[PDB]
Amino acid sequence: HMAQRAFPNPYADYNKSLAEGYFDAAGRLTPEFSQRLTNKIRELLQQMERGLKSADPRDGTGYTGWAGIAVLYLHLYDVFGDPAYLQLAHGYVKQSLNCLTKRSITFLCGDAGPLAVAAVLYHKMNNEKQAEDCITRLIHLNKIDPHAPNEMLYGRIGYIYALLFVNKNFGVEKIPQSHIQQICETILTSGENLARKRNFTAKSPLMYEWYQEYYVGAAHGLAGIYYYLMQPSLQVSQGKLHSLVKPSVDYVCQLKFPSGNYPPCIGDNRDLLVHWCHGAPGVIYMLIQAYKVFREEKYLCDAYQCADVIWQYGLLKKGYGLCHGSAGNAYAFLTLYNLTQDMKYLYRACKFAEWCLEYGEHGCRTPDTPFSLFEGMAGTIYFLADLLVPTKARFPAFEL
Ligand SMILES: N[C@@H](CCC(=O)N[C@@H](CS)C(=O)NCC(=O)O)C(=O)O
Ligand SMILES: [Zn+2]
């Protein structure tokens, strides 16, 4: 059913000859291809700026609203060094800070996005008072909540991301490790408890759910949570890594469809969605991190299969977005490239970029938020700009 959701891939797979137009033998993009990316970035930014005039004033979130546009501009400032991008970021930060709803804790869908992004923006503009005030508020956002989910968009790991985002950008431990540690403990305890209650323990020592479903993928599910639990920056003990996390990862691996794709939820039979939010483009991060941490070939094998699924069925009719679109899917190639150093995957990313350079010429659906970071144009632009230096590229608001 995957074929129904994708355009046929018109591109030939990697060879040295075809790759030479995109990058040199060291994987550095050609000046020509770099400039083509740059030209499209500039073109799309104009469209995005105009389109955002019609966006909902109330939505300040990273996923669909103002803080996500600020994320893009902070990134463009880092990539290009144009002070105008930092100024644009400031404007969007200011909008986002007028939109706090006090309903959610996450970087993507909650108040942590505006606060963390503002902290970084103010820091980059040498505004210590405002930066520090934002950090204080971010730290305070963490309330005791036994019913809070564990996943990326609305749960504990999404709050953790905001903390990591501040620390990374300040280059110092602004938020004490102990804050992250306490949340990590809660996540692990929650997982063990649910697995015990449902008698998953034997096959999976941890289990998580969101809206009463066992989601598998990056956005709402197991792959996102385990990706985080395996991250050195969360400092999960070797004991818990091996006794709890690894067998839980292995359980997810065993859910793989024959195609190499993954079900949205445990028990789902229809092999349909090839998205970051649901399916191989999101699960790949868990597999790659598991390979890095455990060094078992099976994880790398599965990652290759993800890349092949995405190469065949990853050019989505949904559009060019990050959450569920061609640009988000292209990041899967970059993560595998950055692990393997295999230029085949850099090439695949470049070809997906080629597709995005024909933005709007394919008959894709218009997203609900056509200009947002996760549904719309801002995310596509983010990807194009990130591709300029492939080794540093990271799926935004998610990848560490
Ligand atoms: N609001 C989205 C459309 C909804 C959507 O695609 N949702 C994702 C999850 S975030 C999905 O996988 N939907 C199920 C499907 O495609 O069947 C947009 O405008 O891009
Ligand atoms: Zn999605």
Curated annotation (Swiss-Prot):
Its main location: cytoplasm. It catalyses: RX + glutathione = an S-substituted glutathione + a halide anion + H(+); 1-chloro-2,4-dinitrobenzene + glutathione = 2,4-dinitrophenyl-S-glutathione + chloride + H(+). Glutathione binds at residues 318, 365-368. It is a peripheral membrane protein. The keyword Cell division does not apply. It comes from the Eukaryota. Was originally thought to be a G-protein coupled receptor. Belongs to the LanC-like protein family. This is Glutathione S-transferase LANCL1. It comes from Homo sapiens (Human). The lineage of its organism: Eukaryota, Metazoa, Chordata, Craniata, Vertebrata.
